[PDB]
Amino acid sequence: ATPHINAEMGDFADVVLMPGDPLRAKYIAETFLEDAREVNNVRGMLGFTGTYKGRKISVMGHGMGIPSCSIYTKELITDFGVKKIIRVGSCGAVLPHVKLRDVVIGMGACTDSKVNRIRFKDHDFAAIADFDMVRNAVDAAKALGIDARVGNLFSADLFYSPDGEMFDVMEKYGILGVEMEAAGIYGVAAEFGAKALTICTVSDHIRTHEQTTAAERQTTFNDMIKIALESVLLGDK
Amino acid sequence: ATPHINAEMGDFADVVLMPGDPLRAKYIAETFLEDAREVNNVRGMLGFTGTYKGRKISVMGHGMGIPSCSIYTKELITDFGVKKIIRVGSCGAVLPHVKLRDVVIGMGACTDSKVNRIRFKDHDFAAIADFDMVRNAVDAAKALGIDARVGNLFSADLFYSPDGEMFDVMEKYGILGVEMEAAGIYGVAAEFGAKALTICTVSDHIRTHEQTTAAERQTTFNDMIKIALESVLLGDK
Amino acid sequence: ATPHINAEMGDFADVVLMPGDPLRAKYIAETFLEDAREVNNVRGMLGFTGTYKGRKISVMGHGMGIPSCSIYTKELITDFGVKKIIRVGSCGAVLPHVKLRDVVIGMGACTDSKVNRIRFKDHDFAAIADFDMVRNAVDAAKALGIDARVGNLFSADLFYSPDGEMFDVMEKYGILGVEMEAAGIYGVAAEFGAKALTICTVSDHIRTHEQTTAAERQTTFNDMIKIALESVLLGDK
Amino acid sequence: ATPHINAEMGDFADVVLMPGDPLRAKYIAETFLEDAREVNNVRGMLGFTGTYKGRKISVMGHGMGIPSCSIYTKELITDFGVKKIIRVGSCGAVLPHVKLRDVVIGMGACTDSKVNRIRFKDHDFAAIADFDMVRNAVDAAKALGIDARVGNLFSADLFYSPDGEMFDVMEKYGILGVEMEAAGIYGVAAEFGAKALTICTVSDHIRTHEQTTAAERQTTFNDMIKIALESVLLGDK
Amino acid sequence: ATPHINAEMGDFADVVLMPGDPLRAKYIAETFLEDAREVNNVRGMLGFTGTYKGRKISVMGHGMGIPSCSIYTKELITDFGVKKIIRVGSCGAVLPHVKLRDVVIGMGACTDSKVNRIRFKDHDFAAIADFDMVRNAVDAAKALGIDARVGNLFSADLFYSPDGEMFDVMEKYGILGVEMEAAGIYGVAAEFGAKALTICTVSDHIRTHEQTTAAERQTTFNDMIKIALESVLLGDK
Amino acid sequence: ATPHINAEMGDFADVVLMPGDPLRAKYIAETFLEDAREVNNVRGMLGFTGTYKGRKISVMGHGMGIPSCSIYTKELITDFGVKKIIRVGSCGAVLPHVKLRDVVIGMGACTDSKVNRIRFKDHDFAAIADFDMVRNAVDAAKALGIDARVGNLFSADLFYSPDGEMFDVMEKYGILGVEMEAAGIYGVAAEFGAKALTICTVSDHIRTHEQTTAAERQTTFNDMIKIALESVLLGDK
Ligand SMILES: Nc1ncnc2c([C@@H]3O[C@H](CO)[C@@H](O)[C@H]3O)n[nH]c12
Ligand SMILES: Nc1ncnc2c([C@@H]3O[C@H](CO)[C@@H](O)[C@H]3O)n[nH]c12
């Protein structure tokens, strides 16, 4: 066990799906997993292990922001034998053609956090995913007839940024989605020698006003979950 | 009424105590508050409002890391009329005679996060508590006959630093406690015009490797809560 | 002696008042201290030692800027047994309610200097005062019937900044007064194990353009001196 | 024509392979392209256009270093209708399991250059390749019976670094290969709205200075060119 | 032989003139050097050695940008006994009163590269020329009737820079010319114990001014080469 | 008049010699100047005006450190029509071959200060002296049978370095001497359009046991003053 996960080596599958919201981890375990068992509840950061089409799969919230998710992913990797991490989150969009409910696959993650410069002697560490995992998610998405873009995300430290112009810079450089985790998870993966992938669904268009019914947000969340789970199976071959 | 807090104006007291552990926030509500009612449960980040010795007080989790607490503290200040935030957290000690369960008060907070540099044109912003809140906490702790050292905290982005030597630097500069939120909450306090104070209980020693349990962090750090709660009463004068 | 102070251990009190202007030190010694003797004149940086109401007390100029005061504060601490340093200075205001000749107490000090980053492996060190010293100053002013605000100062390297926009940021984040030394003295204090506090008298307003003369700065900011000297007696318990 | 390219629109294919060495571009043109024609010789930086399995393809040197390749790739993109750039180079390995003659595909490229911080408001831009081009080069390599590793390159400004310790940092976060261009190219691609990819063969292992005979270097160089070309054809469909 | 120069000790004079363009190096050899012979052609980077008025001189292109010339200049100093490097190039002007075909001598070289910060522990290294070489060039030019401007160059990493506003900053601080190598060469000079100088002719004006008019000098490219060669002769005396 | 100088336009010559120590300025005026008159004493920063060999010359202290001297040089340039500033001080030698007697002329000045980065958009400004003043000083020195050394100074913010990591680095890149002002004055000069020079005598030399009797140090200090004063007369031609 660790100070943030009341569990032991074995309670987790070698692949963990991670939404920000612990309750979405509960929903995911209750809906797409068989024989789900709750394996962590320290700080209410719910985690579950079960099976998807006969493959052992875990799912556990990471909380919001680079520091939070850095703790959980690091601990999972070094203390619970985890090999792959798939974050299933939401993101804000800055591109004109990226619409709500669109799926995005962070091949890379830009960030305004210092965590990677701390790791990397103040140089530019390109926080990227594991390629096979990105390929798996792309191929799974196709098999499900879901459209996804593969590119850069931007993991932000401040949800409420005093730096509004930055969004114009993100758009200029083709950032597909703005969330709060990817660059930190990718930094942990590189530091501790595991593989990670971030998939998001666009839940709001920054500098725009339009919404979606609760029914649509769910199906879209389900689609993300399905892309994620199915890509694991492709990953296993 | 806000993106991470499903509550309405009035649901929160004008003062909110905030551990990072939403479950500590539950314990505190159940143990120190009367007539407490749950006022938030979004993302399992439990918030409660009740009374202490007659005074309306709220307690709510803020999650781990600067990005996580920046969100909740921003939203309480700008949208729930919150005037005071008292962070009540845990911390790692670096000094040889700061021991387990010592209470320390963050008058200022160092950080390796970039959020204040971002706010402050890449210069050094001294992240500090409201003085009067510090004085209320000092006088409250004296009346209870609980020791409390006042000084600098260090708000870390990485619980697991790659840079072991930073700890030696923190020690050299008299850092009383290593945690993950203080400098962040102080940034939001200054930015949106509120008052903040961080009080922490030492939950592990980075050198002797003494540490507490998750169960102990969640429910046995009560000196700091008495201090925070009595300090609010001194504030009302 | 030390390279910038021609005196011996014992010549200074354990508490040393330090304005930037040595001529102000002279005025303070001749006006507030009994039986004052000059104890330094290296580089014209006059330092004196007298008694204040029976308490042995020193006052000495520290020059303009962080590099200047960092030299004197270091030398006093390591070679003259000085335990407390109270900088008594002048500062420019940016806040609309802050008037000329207002006394401000620097609990914290922001800076655009690189010295603390040099100290703190390029992270954010919160340059803070000693708490008790702050509290003493607060209580001493209350006893004297002198108003004083406690909070953040900004320690500037460039008195004539090309970045006029930085004042707008200082104001937004509640900076009480702009000077050139506080963050550097707090840095030295932390590095060498002593305690410091900066009290300033507002000598010009950056927005209203209202100003005082050199001669007024040199001798007429006496509120802060009474507060400083009386706070020392309080600190003696 | 452009300042550094004396040719006209039409003279380049929409895809340009780019080795650092202009002489190797001539070699690629003579070895792989039918009816190759020289289309640039400004600054001796040879560019050629021909056909490969009936497909118009170009090859041009980009010189050494980020600022150099940035110049050429930019002009190609804005004035020659070039949609894809494939850098083909050699790289140094820092990982022990990464052997001489391995093909390394840079899905992302780290760097100690400031060019991208300049572009991205001093934040971390994750310099990445176009995903499809990565996947094409992977599929092409497989059909050729070759296993290419996909991950991060490090793009160095200094071939002769004063700081040998940086290599251990690169090793610790999984850098596959060390070159001097990729991150700059990825930077240009995102700024001006085109697609890039860098493929390298490992020529030396930086730690033990262990290297390879010209015969095996010519061989693996050709395999790299074969992969790059076959990648374009997969991309076309 | 070095990894970028196929020659042997002796093949190069102890003074090397360097243009960006290898073809320019070719032009210089045939125009000014008697008994000119080619000593390198690796990567088409033409180098030559002949005599100018019986003085053994070499001329060799350095390629474009700080990383490219840093390679060549390092290898020349460390393995070929080169003592002096004289960069001869073109530069753009940002000041109104600097006119076309003015000759600018870089006694200093500002930069937006990170190479010197990497060398200098992230501080400000002032990348400067050798003082004797500067005066030799001033004196050489005066003898020819040209008033060379002595001051700062700016070594840009991006010929196509995203930040136009920086040019206003360059104008404000008196930068004489904008090229791409000088700071890097001055960096190498200092690191490896050699002497360097960059001389440039003003070949255009950067950006449109309602105050830029000045005039035009008759100063040819050939004139700049004369100044450089003659300045070597002065240095020998 | 300004807040740091109680004088009026006309009270200063258009050239000002500036030691750090104001008593030294008094010494300089009394020794080399005819009809020396005190023109400033605000903050005891003694400034004097008189003539040397019929030529109007002023001399005034600038205090210790970049921030102090920046205030005075700016004010002299923008308010007293000063055109040339010659710093006359001392420095420590890091290079073995730079003896404890030598005159060093700072053609450029490195620094660990942030003041130029604040001026130059966080890039590298090469803080340089005006060339002609450099040449005037070399000639004044030569005529007095003194061989000045021309090169880089290092301008330190921290006389008492926390770790002293930079001394070996200064030695590696050829820094002639260490003081605390040069880079700052040069930046003011660049910023406000005047001309500066720093001259220093080597007052301490690391790693040896070199001895000087005061007959040798007074001769050498006077030597520096003559060099500076004679350099002005040369510049007047
Ligand atoms: N040694 C340590 N280092 C960093 N953070 C913490 C904490 C607090 O607990 C959380 C991470 O464990 C986070 O909220 C932080 O503030 N306790 N002990 C700590
Ligand atoms: N508007 C202003 N900005 C910066 N510093 C000061 C001061 C202080 O006074 C001195 C310069 O006037 C120096 O010590 C500085 O800290 N007064 N007014 C100021």
Author numbering:
A (entry chain D), B (entry chain A), C (entry chain F), D (entry chain B), E (entry chain E), F (entry chain C): 1 to 237
Sentences from the paper on this structure:
Purine nucleoside phosphorylase (PNP, purine nucleoside orthophosphate ribosyl transferase, EC 2.4.2.1) has a crucial role in the purine salvage pathway. It catalyses the reversible phosphorolytic cleavage of the glycosidic bond of purine (2′-deoxy) nucleosides, generating the corresponding free base and (2′-deoxy) ribose 1-phosphate. E. coli PNP is an excellent molecular machine conducting efficient catalysis of purine nucleosides glycosidic bond cleavage. It is a homohexamer, built as a trimer of dimers, with all its subunits having the active site in the open conformation in the apo enzyme form. Monomers in each dimer mutually donate two amino acids (His4 and Arg43) to complete their active sites.
In the case of orthorhombic structures of the wild-type enzyme with two formycin molecules (WT-6(P/S)-2FA) and of the double mutant complexes with two and four formycin molecules per hexamer bound, (DM-6(P/S)-2FA and DM-6(P/S)-4FA, respectively) all six monomers are crystallographically independent, whereas in the case of hexagonal structures of the wild-type and the mutant with six formycin molecules bound by each hexamer (WT-6(P/S)-6FA and DM-6(P/S)-6FA) two halves of the hexamer are related by the crystallographic two-fold axis. In the orthorhombic structures, dimers A-D and F-C are closed-open dimers and B-E form an open-open dimer, while in the hexagonal forms A-D is the closed-open dimer and B-B’ is the open-open dimer formed by crystallographic two-fold symmetry. In the structure of WT-6(P/S)-2FA, the FA molecules are found only in the closed active sites A and F with final occupancies of 0.7. All of the active sites in the open conformation in this complex are occupied only by water molecules. This is the first time that the presence of nucleoside type substrate only in the active sites in closed conformations was shown. In the case of WT, at low nucleoside concentrations, the nucleoside is bound mostly in sites adopting a closed conformation, which facilitates protonation, hence also catalysis.
